[PDB]
Paper text:
The nucleotide-activated sugar precursor UDP-glucose is produced from UTP and glucose-1-phosphate by UTP-glucose-1-phosphate uridylyltransferase (UGPase) enzymes. However, apart from GtaB, two other predicted UGPases, YtdA and YngB, are encoded in the B. subtilis 168 genome: as part of this study, we investigated the function of YngB. Here we show that, based on its crystal structure and in vitro and in vivo biochemical activity, the B. subtilis YngB protein is a functional UGPase. Furthermore, our data show that YngB is a functional UGPase that augments UDP-glucose production under oxygen-limiting conditions.
Numbering used by the authors:
A (entry chain B): 3 to 222, 228 to 297
B (entry chain A): 2 to 222, 228 to 298
The structure:
Amino acid sequence: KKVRKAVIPAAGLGTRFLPATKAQPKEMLPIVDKPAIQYIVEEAAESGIEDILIITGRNKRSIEDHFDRSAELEFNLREKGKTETLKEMQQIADLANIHYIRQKEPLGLGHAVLCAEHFIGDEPFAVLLGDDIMVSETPALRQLMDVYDVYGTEVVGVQSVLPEDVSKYGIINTSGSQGHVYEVNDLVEKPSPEEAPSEIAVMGRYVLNSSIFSVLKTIGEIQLTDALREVCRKEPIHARLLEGNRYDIGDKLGCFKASTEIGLMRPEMRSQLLAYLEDVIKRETKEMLR
Amino acid sequence: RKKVRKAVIPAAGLGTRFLPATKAQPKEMLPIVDKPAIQYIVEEAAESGIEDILIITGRNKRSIEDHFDRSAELEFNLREKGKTETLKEMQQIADLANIHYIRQKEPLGLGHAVLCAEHFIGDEPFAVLLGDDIMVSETPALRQLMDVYDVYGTEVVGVQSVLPEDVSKYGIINTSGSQGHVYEVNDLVEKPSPEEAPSEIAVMGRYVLNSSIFSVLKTIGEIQLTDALREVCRKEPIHARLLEGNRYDIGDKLGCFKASTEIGLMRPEMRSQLLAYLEDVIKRETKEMLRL
Protein backbone atom coordinates (compact mmCIF):
# COMPACT_ATOMS: atom_id res chain seq x y z
CA LYS A 1 0.00 0.00 0.00
CA LYS A 2 1.37 3.34 -1.30
CA VAL A 3 1.01 6.42 0.98
CA ARG A 4 -1.50 8.73 -0.70
CA LYS A 5 -3.09 10.59 2.20
CA ALA A 6 -1.56 13.11 4.60
CA VAL A 7 -2.50 15.07 7.72
CA ILE A 8 -1.49 18.67 8.43
CA PRO A 9 -2.63 19.64 12.01
CA ALA A 10 -3.25 23.38 11.97
CA ALA A 11 -5.34 24.30 15.01
CA GLY A 12 -2.61 26.33 16.77
CA LEU A 13 -3.69 29.73 18.01
CA GLY A 14 -0.04 30.70 17.33
CA THR A 15 0.70 33.02 20.26
CA ARG A 16 4.44 33.23 19.51
CA PHE A 17 3.65 35.55 16.61
CA LEU A 18 1.44 38.08 18.37
CA PRO A 19 0.32 40.55 17.28
CA ALA A 20 0.67 39.34 13.68
CA THR A 21 -1.65 36.48 14.54
CA LYS A 22 -4.16 38.19 16.82
CA ALA A 23 -6.79 38.01 14.06
CA GLN A 24 -5.22 35.76 11.39
CA PRO A 25 -3.61 32.28 11.50
CA LYS A 26 0.06 31.36 11.91
CA GLU A 27 -0.13 29.02 8.91
CA MET A 28 -0.79 31.99 6.62
CA LEU A 29 2.08 34.24 7.66
CA PRO A 30 3.99 34.75 4.41
CA ILE A 31 7.38 33.05 4.06
CA VAL A 32 8.68 34.71 1.07
CA ASP A 33 5.46 35.79 -0.51
CA LYS A 34 3.95 32.35 0.17
CA PRO A 35 1.85 31.41 3.24
CA ALA A 36 3.73 28.93 5.38
CA ILE A 37 0.98 26.34 4.90
CA GLN A 38 1.54 26.50 1.12
CA TYR A 39 5.12 25.19 1.49
CA ILE A 40 3.82 22.16 3.43
CA VAL A 41 0.96 21.38 1.03
CA GLU A 42 3.54 21.79 -1.77
CA GLU A 43 5.86 19.25 -0.15
CA ALA A 44 2.97 16.79 0.14
CA ALA A 45 1.76 17.29 -3.44
CA GLU A 46 5.32 16.93 -4.78
CA SER A 47 5.80 13.72 -2.77
CA GLY A 48 2.74 12.38 -4.63
CA ILE A 49 0.15 12.72 -1.83
CA GLU A 50 -3.24 13.25 -3.47
CA ASP A 51 -5.41 13.97 -0.40
CA ILE A 52 -4.73 16.05 2.70
CA LEU A 53 -6.80 16.41 5.86
CA ILE A 54 -6.17 19.73 7.57
CA ILE A 55 -7.24 19.67 11.20
CA THR A 56 -8.33 23.22 11.67
CA GLY A 57 -9.89 25.42 14.36
CA ARG A 58 -11.95 28.60 14.58
CA ASN A 59 -11.22 31.58 12.31
CA LYS A 60 -8.90 29.73 9.92
CA ARG A 61 -11.22 30.17 6.89
CA SER A 62 -8.41 31.93 5.10
CA ILE A 63 -6.53 28.57 4.77
CA GLU A 64 -9.55 27.00 3.10
CA ASP A 65 -9.88 30.05 0.88
CA HIS A 66 -6.23 30.05 -0.13
CA PHE A 67 -6.62 26.62 -1.71
CA ASP A 68 -9.88 27.36 -3.51
CA ARG A 69 -10.61 29.43 -6.62
CA SER A 70 -10.96 33.15 -5.72
CA ALA A 71 -13.44 34.43 -8.35
CA GLU A 72 -12.98 38.18 -7.75
CA LEU A 73 -9.19 37.74 -7.89
CA GLU A 74 -9.35 35.74 -11.15
CA PHE A 75 -11.45 38.45 -12.85
CA ASN A 76 -9.13 41.23 -11.64
CA LEU A 77 -6.02 39.39 -12.79
CA ARG A 78 -7.52 38.89 -16.27
CA GLU A 79 -8.57 42.58 -16.63
CA LYS A 80 -4.92 43.44 -15.93
CA GLY A 81 -3.20 40.91 -18.16
CA LYS A 82 -1.46 38.94 -15.41
CA THR A 83 -1.93 35.62 -17.17
CA GLU A 84 1.22 34.05 -15.82
CA THR A 85 -0.27 35.04 -12.47
CA LEU A 86 -3.87 33.93 -12.98
CA LYS A 87 -2.28 30.61 -13.92
CA GLU A 88 -0.12 30.28 -10.76
CA MET A 89 -3.27 31.07 -8.74
CA GLN A 90 -5.20 28.23 -10.35
CA GLN A 91 -2.41 25.73 -9.71
CA ILE A 92 -2.61 26.40 -6.00
CA ALA A 93 -6.17 25.13 -6.14
CA ASP A 94 -4.90 22.04 -7.96
CA LEU A 95 -2.02 20.89 -5.69
CA ALA A 96 -4.11 18.35 -3.77
CA ASN A 97 -7.67 17.59 -2.61
CA ILE A 98 -7.86 19.43 0.68
CA HIS A 99 -10.22 18.07 3.34
CA TYR A 100 -10.89 19.87 6.64
CA ILE A 101 -12.10 18.80 10.05
CA ARG A 102 -12.47 20.92 13.14
CA GLN A 103 -10.47 19.92 16.22
CA LYS A 104 -12.97 20.49 18.95
CA GLU A 105 -10.98 21.89 21.87
CA PRO A 106 -7.10 22.01 21.97
CA LEU A 107 -6.07 18.52 23.12
CA GLY A 108 -2.77 18.44 21.17
CA LEU A 109 -1.16 16.58 18.22
CA GLY A 110 -2.22 13.14 19.44
CA HIS A 111 -5.89 14.09 19.48
CA ALA A 112 -5.32 15.72 16.07
CA VAL A 113 -3.90 12.53 14.54
CA LEU A 114 -6.81 10.52 15.94
CA CYS A 115 -9.29 12.89 14.24
CA ALA A 116 -7.89 11.58 10.96
CA GLU A 117 -8.89 8.01 11.78
CA HIS A 118 -11.92 7.53 9.53
CA PHE A 119 -10.60 9.79 6.75
CA ILE A 120 -7.47 7.76 6.09
CA GLY A 121 -9.20 4.62 7.36
CA ASP A 122 -7.07 1.65 6.39
CA GLU A 123 -4.07 3.13 4.59
CA PRO A 124 -0.63 4.26 5.86
CA PHE A 125 -0.52 7.98 6.15
CA ALA A 126 1.88 10.93 6.29
CA VAL A 127 1.78 13.52 9.04
CA LEU A 128 3.38 16.96 8.49
CA LEU A 129 3.67 19.45 11.35
CA GLY A 130 3.96 22.87 9.91
CA ASP A 131 7.03 23.94 11.85
CA ASP A 132 9.90 23.79 9.37
CA ILE A 133 10.42 24.27 5.64
CA MET A 134 12.63 21.81 3.74
CA VAL A 135 14.65 22.58 0.62
CA SER A 136 15.86 19.31 -1.01
CA GLU A 137 16.38 17.75 -4.46
CA THR A 138 14.06 14.99 -3.17
CA PRO A 139 11.07 16.28 -1.10
CA ALA A 140 11.46 15.46 2.59
CA LEU A 141 8.24 13.41 2.70
CA ARG A 142 9.10 11.56 -0.51
CA GLN A 143 12.19 10.45 1.39
CA LEU A 144 10.30 9.01 4.43
CA MET A 145 7.96 7.40 1.87
CA ASP A 146 10.81 5.53 0.14
CA VAL A 147 11.91 4.08 3.45
CA TYR A 148 8.23 3.09 3.97
CA ASP A 149 7.95 1.38 0.57
CA VAL A 150 10.86 -0.72 1.76
CA TYR A 151 10.36 -1.57 5.47
CA GLY A 152 6.59 -0.98 5.61
CA THR A 153 6.75 0.13 9.29
CA GLU A 154 6.38 3.52 11.02
CA VAL A 155 9.09 5.74 9.49
CA VAL A 156 10.12 9.05 11.08
CA GLY A 157 11.97 12.04 9.56
CA VAL A 158 15.21 13.07 11.21
CA GLN A 159 18.20 15.40 11.24
CA SER A 160 21.17 15.57 13.62
CA VAL A 161 21.29 18.51 15.98
CA LEU A 162 23.95 19.99 18.31
CA PRO A 163 23.76 18.73 21.95
CA GLU A 164 22.36 21.28 24.42
CA ASP A 165 19.54 21.57 21.89
CA VAL A 166 18.18 18.09 22.49
CA SER A 167 15.74 19.49 25.09
CA LYS A 168 13.87 21.46 22.40
CA TYR A 169 13.37 18.37 20.20
CA GLY A 170 12.83 14.59 20.33
CA ILE A 171 15.35 11.76 19.86
CA ILE A 172 16.07 8.62 17.79
CA ASN A 173 17.38 5.96 20.15
CA THR A 174 19.47 4.15 17.56
CA SER A 175 21.28 0.90 18.18
CA GLY A 176 21.77 0.37 14.45
CA SER A 177 22.40 2.55 11.36
CA GLN A 178 22.29 1.40 7.73
CA GLY A 179 22.24 3.50 4.54
CA HIS A 180 20.75 6.96 5.10
CA VAL A 181 18.27 5.08 7.28
CA TYR A 182 18.87 4.86 11.06
CA GLU A 183 16.96 2.15 12.94
CA VAL A 184 14.93 3.06 15.98
CA ASN A 185 14.60 1.07 19.19
CA ASP A 186 13.30 3.89 21.36
CA LEU A 187 12.27 7.54 21.61
CA VAL A 188 12.16 10.40 24.09
CA GLU A 189 10.37 13.75 24.24
CA LYS A 190 12.34 16.80 25.43
CA PRO A 191 15.29 14.82 26.99
CA SER A 192 17.45 16.80 29.46
CA PRO A 193 20.98 17.15 27.94
CA GLU A 194 22.20 14.16 29.98
CA GLU A 195 19.01 12.08 29.61
CA ALA A 196 19.42 12.37 25.81
CA PRO A 197 20.54 9.02 24.31
CA SER A 198 21.52 10.55 20.94
CA GLU A 199 22.08 13.77 19.04
CA ILE A 200 19.42 13.02 16.40
CA ALA A 201 15.94 14.60 16.40
CA VAL A 202 12.69 14.09 14.50
CA MET A 203 11.82 16.88 12.10
CA GLY A 204 7.98 17.08 12.19
CA ARG A 205 7.55 14.45 9.47
CA TYR A 206 6.11 10.92 9.73
CA VAL A 207 4.58 8.04 7.90
CA LEU A 208 2.21 5.87 10.00
CA ASN A 209 -0.26 2.97 9.77
CA SER A 210 -3.83 2.38 10.99
CA SER A 211 -2.16 0.12 13.54
CA ILE A 212 -0.86 3.35 15.07
CA PHE A 213 -4.46 4.50 15.14
CA SER A 214 -5.62 1.75 17.48
CA VAL A 215 -2.33 2.08 19.49
CA LEU A 216 -3.06 5.78 20.09
CA LYS A 217 -6.67 4.91 20.96
CA THR A 218 -5.39 2.45 23.63
CA ILE A 219 -2.74 4.77 25.23
CA GLY A 220 -5.61 7.27 25.65
CA GLU A 221 -3.24 15.29 26.18
CA ILE A 222 -1.89 12.30 24.24
CA GLN A 223 1.74 12.75 23.08
CA LEU A 224 2.27 11.00 19.71
CA THR A 225 5.75 9.76 20.64
CA ASP A 226 4.55 7.49 23.46
CA ALA A 227 2.70 5.66 20.70
CA LEU A 228 5.68 5.57 18.33
CA ARG A 229 7.39 4.30 21.55
CA GLU A 230 4.92 1.56 22.51
CA VAL A 231 5.16 0.42 18.88
CA CYS A 232 8.93 0.12 19.34
CA ARG A 233 8.61 -2.19 22.34
CA LYS A 234 6.68 -4.63 20.15
CA GLU A 235 8.78 -3.96 17.04
CA PRO A 236 11.56 -1.64 15.72
CA ILE A 237 10.61 1.37 13.56
CA HIS A 238 12.84 3.26 11.08
CA ALA A 239 14.14 6.86 10.52
CA ARG A 240 15.59 8.63 7.46
CA LEU A 241 18.31 11.25 7.59
CA LEU A 242 16.63 14.01 5.66
CA GLU A 243 18.85 15.21 2.83
CA GLY A 244 18.15 18.91 2.34
CA ASN A 245 18.05 22.28 4.09
CA ARG A 246 15.83 22.78 7.15
CA TYR A 247 14.35 26.15 8.22
CA ASP A 248 12.60 26.00 11.61
CA ILE A 249 9.70 28.50 11.56
CA GLY A 250 8.54 28.20 15.20
CA ASP A 251 10.16 31.60 16.02
CA LYS A 252 9.68 35.16 14.78
CA LEU A 253 13.38 35.14 14.03
CA GLY A 254 12.99 31.62 12.61
CA CYS A 255 10.59 33.09 10.03
CA PHE A 256 12.95 35.97 9.36
CA LYS A 257 15.78 33.48 8.61
CA ALA A 258 13.50 31.31 6.44
CA SER A 259 12.41 34.27 4.29
CA THR A 260 15.96 35.45 3.68
CA GLU A 261 17.32 32.02 2.76
CA ILE A 262 14.47 31.04 0.51
CA GLY A 263 14.70 34.65 -0.71
CA LEU A 264 18.25 33.91 -1.80
CA MET A 265 17.09 31.14 -4.10
CA ARG A 266 14.87 33.51 -6.03
CA PRO A 267 17.14 34.84 -8.85
CA GLU A 268 15.46 38.28 -9.01
CA MET A 269 15.78 38.81 -5.24
CA ARG A 270 19.09 37.08 -4.60
CA SER A 271 21.37 39.98 -5.58
CA GLN A 272 18.97 42.73 -4.46
CA LEU A 273 18.80 40.99 -1.09
CA LEU A 274 22.51 40.31 -0.76
CA ALA A 275 23.48 43.84 -1.86
CA TYR A 276 21.01 45.22 0.68
CA LEU A 277 22.49 43.14 3.53
CA GLU A 278 26.02 44.21 2.69
CA ASP A 279 24.93 47.85 2.87
CA VAL A 280 23.08 47.31 6.18
CA ILE A 281 26.21 45.80 7.72
CA LYS A 282 28.34 48.69 6.38
CA ARG A 283 25.89 51.21 7.86
CA GLU A 284 25.96 49.39 11.19
CA THR A 285 29.77 49.40 11.46
CA LYS A 286 30.10 53.08 10.45
CA GLU A 287 27.42 53.96 13.04
CA MET A 288 29.12 51.89 15.79
CA LEU A 289 32.43 53.67 15.10
CA ARG A 290 31.17 57.09 16.35
CA ARG B 1 -9.88 77.42 13.38
CA LYS B 2 -10.75 73.72 14.02
CA LYS B 3 -8.65 70.75 15.21
CA VAL B 4 -7.97 67.76 12.86
CA ARG B 5 -9.21 64.66 14.69
CA LYS B 6 -10.50 62.34 11.96
CA ALA B 7 -8.50 60.30 9.44
CA VAL B 8 -9.55 58.24 6.41
CA ILE B 9 -7.50 55.11 5.61
CA PRO B 10 -8.55 53.71 2.17
CA ALA B 11 -7.92 49.95 2.12
CA ALA B 12 -9.76 48.17 -0.68
CA GLY B 13 -6.95 46.81 -2.94
CA LEU B 14 -6.51 43.15 -3.91
CA GLY B 15 -2.77 43.54 -3.32
CA THR B 16 -1.58 41.93 -6.53
CA ARG B 17 2.04 43.01 -6.00
CA PHE B 18 2.01 40.53 -3.10
CA LEU B 19 0.53 37.30 -4.60
CA PRO B 20 0.20 34.57 -3.57
CA ALA B 21 0.48 35.84 0.06
CA THR B 22 -2.54 38.03 -0.48
CA LYS B 23 -4.52 35.39 -2.35
CA ALA B 24 -7.01 34.96 0.47
CA GLN B 25 -5.93 37.55 2.99
CA PRO B 26 -5.54 41.37 2.84
CA LYS B 27 -2.41 43.29 1.89
CA GLU B 28 -2.80 45.56 4.95
CA MET B 29 -2.62 42.58 7.27
CA LEU B 30 0.80 41.43 6.03
CA PRO B 31 3.25 41.65 8.95
CA ILE B 32 6.02 44.19 8.88
CA VAL B 33 7.99 43.22 11.86
CA ASP B 34 5.49 41.33 13.95
CA LYS B 35 2.70 43.87 13.54
CA PRO B 36 0.25 44.15 10.60
CA ALA B 37 1.05 46.94 8.20
CA ILE B 38 -2.35 48.42 8.91
CA GLN B 39 -1.51 48.70 12.61
CA TYR B 40 1.50 50.93 11.91
CA ILE B 41 -0.80 53.36 10.07
CA VAL B 42 -3.32 53.45 12.92
CA GLU B 43 -0.44 54.00 15.37
CA GLU B 44 0.89 57.00 13.49
CA ALA B 45 -2.69 58.35 13.53
CA ALA B 46 -3.25 57.66 17.22
CA GLU B 47 0.00 59.32 18.37
CA SER B 48 -0.72 62.22 15.97
CA GLY B 49 -3.78 62.75 18.23
CA ILE B 50 -6.33 61.33 15.76
CA GLU B 51 -9.29 59.91 17.65
CA ASP B 52 -11.63 58.63 14.86
CA ILE B 53 -10.55 56.61 11.81
CA LEU B 54 -12.69 55.58 8.83
CA ILE B 55 -11.29 52.58 7.00
CA ILE B 56 -12.82 52.27 3.53
CA THR B 57 -12.68 48.52 3.18
CA GLY B 58 -13.62 45.91 0.56
CA ARG B 59 -14.80 42.27 0.52
CA ASN B 60 -13.17 39.53 2.59
CA LYS B 61 -11.19 42.04 4.62
CA ARG B 62 -12.83 41.17 7.96
CA SER B 63 -9.44 40.45 9.47
CA ILE B 64 -8.64 44.21 9.61
CA GLU B 65 -11.83 44.85 11.67
CA ASP B 66 -11.09 41.87 13.90
CA HIS B 67 -7.51 43.00 14.42
CA PHE B 68 -8.66 46.20 16.23
CA ASP B 69 -11.30 44.55 18.49
CA ARG B 70 -11.39 42.28 21.54
CA SER B 71 -10.45 38.70 20.66
CA ALA B 72 -12.18 36.65 23.35
CA GLU B 73 -10.71 33.19 22.57
CA LEU B 74 -7.17 34.62 22.37
CA GLU B 75 -7.72 36.56 25.61
CA PHE B 76 -8.83 33.42 27.45
CA ASN B 77 -5.90 31.39 26.16
CA LEU B 78 -3.52 34.15 27.19
CA ARG B 79 -4.92 34.35 30.77
CA GLU B 80 -4.80 30.59 31.14
CA LYS B 81 -1.10 30.74 30.11
CA GLY B 82 -0.14 33.76 32.20
CA LYS B 83 0.94 36.01 29.30
CA THR B 84 -0.53 39.07 31.09
CA GLU B 85 2.00 41.30 29.32
CA THR B 86 0.68 40.12 25.95
CA LEU B 87 -2.96 40.24 27.06
CA LYS B 88 -2.36 43.88 27.97
CA GLU B 89 -0.60 44.49 24.67
CA MET B 90 -3.51 43.03 22.66
CA GLN B 91 -5.90 45.11 24.73
CA GLN B 92 -3.93 48.18 23.82
CA ILE B 93 -4.21 47.59 20.08
CA ALA B 94 -7.93 47.44 20.47
CA ASP B 95 -7.68 50.89 22.13
CA LEU B 96 -5.65 52.92 19.65
CA ALA B 97 -8.61 54.73 18.08
CA ASN B 98 -12.27 54.57 17.15
CA ILE B 99 -12.18 52.41 14.06
CA HIS B 100 -15.19 52.81 11.74
CA TYR B 101 -15.62 50.94 8.41
CA ILE B 102 -17.64 51.52 5.26
CA ARG B 103 -17.60 49.32 2.20
CA GLN B 104 -16.59 50.99 -1.05
CA LYS B 105 -19.08 49.15 -3.13
CA GLU B 106 -17.32 49.26 -6.55
CA PRO B 107 -13.52 49.75 -6.86
CA LEU B 108 -13.02 53.19 -8.37
CA GLY B 109 -9.71 53.94 -6.56
CA LEU B 110 -8.93 56.78 -4.08
CA GLY B 111 -10.89 59.97 -4.56
CA HIS B 112 -14.08 57.94 -4.76
CA ALA B 113 -12.73 56.34 -1.62
CA VAL B 114 -12.31 59.78 -0.11
CA LEU B 115 -15.83 60.86 -1.17
CA CYS B 116 -17.09 57.78 0.65
CA ALA B 117 -15.90 59.41 3.87
CA GLU B 118 -17.92 62.57 3.24
CA HIS B 119 -20.81 62.20 5.70
CA PHE B 120 -18.53 60.69 8.30
CA ILE B 121 -16.32 63.72 8.62
CA GLY B 122 -18.97 66.22 7.67
CA ASP B 123 -17.57 69.67 8.29
CA GLU B 124 -14.05 69.48 9.66
CA PRO B 125 -10.49 69.06 8.46
CA PHE B 126 -9.42 65.44 8.10
CA ALA B 127 -6.32 63.39 7.43
CA VAL B 128 -5.97 60.91 4.63
CA LEU B 129 -3.25 58.25 5.02
CA LEU B 130 -2.70 55.85 2.16
CA GLY B 131 -0.53 53.17 3.66
CA ASP B 132 2.44 52.83 1.32
CA ASP B 133 5.30 53.52 3.69
CA ILE B 134 6.27 53.45 7.35
CA MET B 135 7.91 56.60 8.75
CA VAL B 136 10.15 56.48 11.80
CA SER B 137 10.12 59.96 13.34
CA GLU B 138 10.64 61.88 16.57
CA THR B 139 7.39 63.66 15.75
CA PRO B 140 4.72 61.39 14.15
CA ALA B 141 4.67 62.19 10.46
CA LEU B 142 1.02 63.15 10.28
CA ARG B 143 1.33 65.51 13.29
CA GLN B 144 3.92 67.40 11.24
CA LEU B 145 1.37 67.92 8.41
CA MET B 146 -1.20 68.88 11.04
CA ASP B 147 0.98 71.65 12.52
CA VAL B 148 1.30 73.37 9.18
CA TYR B 149 -2.51 73.17 8.85
CA ASP B 150 -2.99 74.81 12.25
CA VAL B 151 -1.04 77.73 10.80
CA TYR B 152 -2.07 78.02 7.12
CA GLY B 153 -5.43 76.20 7.18
CA THR B 154 -5.11 75.23 3.52
CA GLU B 155 -4.96 71.66 2.22
CA VAL B 156 -1.48 70.46 3.29
CA VAL B 157 0.40 67.61 1.62
CA GLY B 158 3.22 65.57 3.17
CA VAL B 159 6.45 65.42 1.16
CA GLN B 160 10.01 64.16 0.89
CA SER B 161 12.44 64.36 -2.00
CA VAL B 162 13.24 61.50 -4.36
CA LEU B 163 15.94 60.73 -6.96
CA PRO B 164 14.83 61.76 -10.50
CA GLU B 165 14.40 58.20 -11.83
CA ASP B 166 11.49 57.45 -9.51
CA VAL B 167 9.42 60.56 -10.16
CA SER B 168 6.86 58.60 -12.18
CA LYS B 169 6.24 56.54 -9.04
CA TYR B 170 4.77 59.60 -7.40
CA GLY B 171 2.76 62.80 -7.51
CA ILE B 172 5.14 65.75 -7.72
CA ILE B 173 4.71 69.15 -6.06
CA ASN B 174 5.54 72.30 -8.01
CA THR B 175 6.77 75.05 -5.73
CA SER B 176 7.49 78.74 -6.01
CA GLY B 177 9.76 78.40 -2.99
CA SER B 178 9.99 77.44 0.65
CA GLN B 179 10.11 78.78 4.16
CA GLY B 180 11.26 76.77 7.18
CA HIS B 181 9.90 73.25 6.50
CA VAL B 182 6.92 74.35 4.44
CA TYR B 183 7.08 74.41 0.63
CA GLU B 184 4.48 76.47 -1.24
CA VAL B 185 2.82 74.10 -3.74
CA ASN B 186 1.69 75.97 -6.84
CA ASP B 187 0.57 72.89 -8.78
CA LEU B 188 0.73 69.09 -8.87
CA VAL B 189 1.18 66.61 -11.69
CA GLU B 190 -0.07 62.99 -11.57
CA LYS B 191 2.77 60.50 -12.21
CA PRO B 192 5.13 62.65 -14.70
CA SER B 193 7.95 61.54 -17.02
CA PRO B 194 11.33 62.47 -15.46
CA GLU B 195 11.64 65.76 -17.42
CA GLU B 196 7.90 66.59 -17.48
CA ALA B 197 8.21 66.52 -13.66
CA PRO B 198 8.67 70.07 -12.21
CA SER B 199 10.48 69.00 -9.04
CA GLU B 200 11.92 65.97 -7.32
CA ILE B 201 9.57 66.51 -4.32
CA ALA B 202 7.01 63.68 -4.04
CA VAL B 203 3.82 63.29 -1.97
CA MET B 204 4.14 60.58 0.69
CA GLY B 205 0.47 59.49 0.89
CA ARG B 206 -0.24 61.90 3.72
CA TYR B 207 -2.85 64.66 3.38
CA VAL B 208 -4.68 67.03 5.66
CA LEU B 209 -7.72 68.23 3.72
CA ASN B 210 -10.72 70.48 4.40
CA SER B 211 -14.42 69.50 4.12
CA SER B 212 -14.50 71.76 1.02
CA ILE B 213 -12.58 69.00 -0.80
CA PHE B 214 -15.88 67.16 -1.20
CA SER B 215 -17.58 69.79 -3.37
CA VAL B 216 -14.41 69.73 -5.42
CA LEU B 217 -14.17 65.94 -5.72
CA LYS B 218 -17.77 65.84 -7.00
CA THR B 219 -17.34 68.38 -9.85
CA ILE B 220 -14.25 66.72 -11.46
CA GLY B 221 -16.43 63.58 -11.83
CA GLU B 222 -12.21 57.54 -12.34
CA ILE B 223 -11.76 60.31 -9.73
CA GLN B 224 -8.10 61.15 -8.99
CA LEU B 225 -7.37 62.78 -5.64
CA THR B 226 -4.58 64.79 -7.26
CA ASP B 227 -6.81 66.59 -9.78
CA ALA B 228 -8.96 67.78 -6.87
CA LEU B 229 -5.90 69.41 -5.43
CA ARG B 230 -5.13 70.75 -8.90
CA GLU B 231 -8.50 72.55 -8.99
CA VAL B 232 -8.00 73.76 -5.38
CA CYS B 233 -4.78 75.07 -6.82
CA ARG B 234 -6.43 77.17 -9.56
CA LYS B 235 -8.21 79.53 -7.10
CA GLU B 236 -5.41 79.56 -4.55
CA PRO B 237 -2.16 77.65 -3.69
CA ILE B 238 -1.66 74.76 -1.24
CA HIS B 239 1.13 73.90 1.22
CA ALA B 240 3.59 71.05 1.69
CA ARG B 241 5.53 69.85 4.69
CA LEU B 242 8.94 68.27 4.37
CA LEU B 243 8.63 65.20 6.56
CA GLU B 244 11.18 64.92 9.35
CA GLY B 245 11.98 61.24 9.65
CA ASN B 246 13.10 57.95 8.03
CA ARG B 247 10.84 56.48 5.37
CA TYR B 248 10.46 52.82 4.41
CA ASP B 249 8.37 52.16 1.31
CA ILE B 250 6.48 48.87 1.53
CA GLY B 251 4.77 48.83 -1.89
CA ASP B 252 7.12 46.06 -3.09
CA LYS B 253 8.05 42.65 -1.71
CA LEU B 254 11.65 43.89 -1.30
CA GLY B 255 10.46 47.14 0.31
CA CYS B 256 8.71 45.20 3.11
CA PHE B 257 11.78 43.03 3.64
CA LYS B 258 13.88 46.17 3.96
CA ALA B 259 11.24 47.62 6.30
CA SER B 260 11.17 44.49 8.45
CA THR B 261 14.95 44.58 8.78
CA GLU B 262 15.17 48.30 9.51
CA ILE B 263 12.40 48.34 12.15
CA GLY B 264 13.67 44.97 13.46
CA LEU B 265 17.12 46.42 14.13
CA MET B 266 15.40 49.13 16.16
CA ARG B 267 13.93 46.53 18.51
CA PRO B 268 16.30 45.88 21.46
CA GLU B 269 15.01 42.36 22.14
CA MET B 270 15.65 41.51 18.50
CA ARG B 271 18.58 43.62 17.49
CA SER B 272 21.50 41.46 18.57
CA GLN B 273 20.24 38.15 17.15
CA LEU B 274 19.18 39.78 13.89
CA LEU B 275 22.49 41.60 13.32
CA ALA B 276 24.24 38.32 14.25
CA TYR B 277 22.16 36.44 11.66
CA LEU B 278 22.78 39.08 8.98
CA GLU B 279 26.60 39.11 9.40
CA ASP B 280 26.43 35.30 9.34
CA VAL B 281 24.57 35.12 6.00
CA ILE B 282 27.16 37.37 4.34
CA LYS B 283 30.05 35.43 5.93
CA ARG B 284 28.51 32.15 4.66
CA GLU B 285 27.91 33.62 1.19
CA THR B 286 31.53 34.77 0.95
CA LYS B 287 33.12 31.43 1.94
CA GLU B 288 30.93 29.54 -0.56
CA MET B 289 31.51 32.05 -3.36
CA LEU B 290 35.33 32.15 -2.97
CA ARG B 291 35.30 28.28 -3.22
CA LEU B 292 33.85 28.58 -6.78
